[PDB]
Design a protein around this ligand. Structure first.
Ligand SMILES: [Cl-]
Length: 208
């Protein structure tokens, strides 16, 4: 397990609507700082299938956690790897659905605009993202499951109490939004350098 801010991230999770078990790569915290005030917003865990994802990362074999974490190409390879992925979010700071969703939407939208990959299709995908989160509430301990069921298919499920949903609650089909959301966590300018640091540890260990 990796414990973050008192929150357990277990070694394995089965995505909602899925039967396949995914394994923990790493976990960390998303914190914000302004005028020296630090606030922990969420904890983040990243899951995939160990040997399947090791199969796409053999060029990083033998490398240490220190080596991997400072190589941007490493995280790029991980975002791009066409394998099943899951990101679990556990809420630390209480947020409304609109609050949480609006910020991740903005992050994705800004990333796509920077790449000149924000067009009508992506706009509609992010409107669906918005529609989904608008009806939700995120008290402390609530959870979000972002599941990459295909490289271009994002499933979202939530629970207010930390239970594991039985099914994907929303499905968004758009390759650019799906990759951009991964980059929110694993890209340059990640919301969580700690999560990246932990994933580097996990994959370094995994590539023996
Ligand atoms: Cl988050």
């Amino acid at each position: 397990k990796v414990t973050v801010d008192g929150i357990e991230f277990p070694p394995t999770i089965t995505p909602p609507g899925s039967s396949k078990s995914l394994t923990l790569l790493g976990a960390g915290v998303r914190g914000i700082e302004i005028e020296a005030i630090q606030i922990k917003v969420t904890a983040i865990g990243v899951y995939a299938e160990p040997e399947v994802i090791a199969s796409h990362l053999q060029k990083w074999k033998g490398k240490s956690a220190s080596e991997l974490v400072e190589d941007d190409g490493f995280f790029k390879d991980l975002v791009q790897a066409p394998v099943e992925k899951l990101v679990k979010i556990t809420m630390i700071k209480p947020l409304t659905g609109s609050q949480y969703g609006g910020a991740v939407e903005e992050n994705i939208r800004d990333r796509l605009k920077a790449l000149d990959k924000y067009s009508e299709a992506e706009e509609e995908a992010l409107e669906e993202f918005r529609e989904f989160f608008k009806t939700k509430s995120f008290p402390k301990g609530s959870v979000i499951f972002f599941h990459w069921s295909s490289p271009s298919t994002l499933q979202i499920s939530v629970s207010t109490d930390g239970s594991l949903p039985e099914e994907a609650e929303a499905t968004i089909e758009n390759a650019n939004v799906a990759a951009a959301l991964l980059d929110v966590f694993l890209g340059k300018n990640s919301v969580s350098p700690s999560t990246k640091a932990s994933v580097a540890e996990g994959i370094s260990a995994l590539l023996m």
